[PDB]
Structure formats: C-alpha cells, structure tokens
Swiss-Prot record:
Acetylated. Phosphorylated by FER. Phosphorylated in response to FGR activation. Phosphorylation by SRC promotes MYLK binding. Phosphorylated on tyrosine residues in response to CHRM1 activation. Phosphorylated by PTK2/FAK1 in response to cell adhesion. Tyrosine phosphorylation in transformed cells may contribute to cellular growth regulation and transformation. Phosphorylated by PKN2 at both serine and threonine residues in a GTP-bound Rac1-dependent manner in hyaluronan-induced astrocytes and hence down-regulated CTTN ability to associate with filamentous actin. The SH3 motif may mediate binding to the cytoskeleton. Expressed at intercalated disks in the heart (at protein level). Expressed in most tissues, except in B-lymphocytes or plasma cells. It comes from Mus musculus (Mouse). It is found in: Cytoplasm, Cytoskeleton; Cell projection, Lamellipodium; Cell projection, Ruffle; Cell projection, Dendrite. Residues 4-60 form the SH3 domain. This is Src substrate cortactin. Part of a complex composed of NEDD9, AURKA and CTTN; within the complex NEDD9 acts as a scaffold protein and is required for complex formation. Interacts (via N-terminus) with NEDD9. Identified in a complex containing FGFR4, NCAM1, CDH2, PLCG1, FRS2, SRC, SHC1, GAP43 and CTTN. Forms a complex with ABL1 and MYLK. Interacts with SHANK2 and SHANK3 (via its SH3 domain). Interacts with PLXDC2 and SRCIN1. Interacts with SAMSN1 (via SH3 domain). Interacts (via SH3 domain) with ASAP1 (via Pro-rich region). Interacts (via SH3 domain) with DNM2. Interacts with ACTN1. Interacts with FER. Contributes to the organization of the actin cytoskeleton and cell shape. Plays a role in the formation of lamellipodia and in cell migration. Plays a role in the regulation of neuron morphology, axon growth and formation of neuronal growth cones. Through its interaction with CTTNBP2, involved in the regulation of neuronal spine density. Plays a role in focal adhesion assembly and turnover. In complex with ABL1 and MYLK regulates cortical actin-based cytoskeletal rearrangement critical to sphingosine 1-phosphate (S1P)-mediated endothelial cell (EC) barrier enhancement. Disulfide bonds: none annotated.
C-alpha cells in the first residue's frame, strides 16, 4: 500500500546520471511516479531516482 505504484524490472539498466537509478532484471521498483513522459521516479534497492519507463513492467 505504502509502496504505491510498483514495477518489476525487465532489463538491466545502468544509471547514466547521479539522479538516475540502476537495476537488474527482476529487481523491484516501488513508490513510482510517472513524472515525465518516459522517465519515471521510484525507489530501487535503497536508491531513489529516475529510470526508463519502458525498462520495467508495472505490477498488479
């Protein structure tokens, strides 16, 4: 519930900025906010930042 909008990573993403996050396939992204277009904001493994929307799959 307090995890908000959540998603499962499909592909490896390696952050390309300090404000970006990294994840591996099957990592979980939580507390997501579709702030801008194809760049969303959420938490993954203690890191809070931007990530590509087309790299993840929303849960439920």
């Amino acid at each position: 519930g307090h995890m908000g909008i959540t998603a499962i990573a499909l592909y490896d993403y390696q952050a390309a900025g300090d404000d970006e996050i990294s994840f591996d396939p099957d990592d979980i992204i939580t507390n997501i906010e579709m702030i801008d277009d194809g760049w969303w904001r959420g938490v993954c493994k203690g890191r809070y930042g931007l990530f590509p929307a087309n790299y993840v799959e929303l849960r439920q």
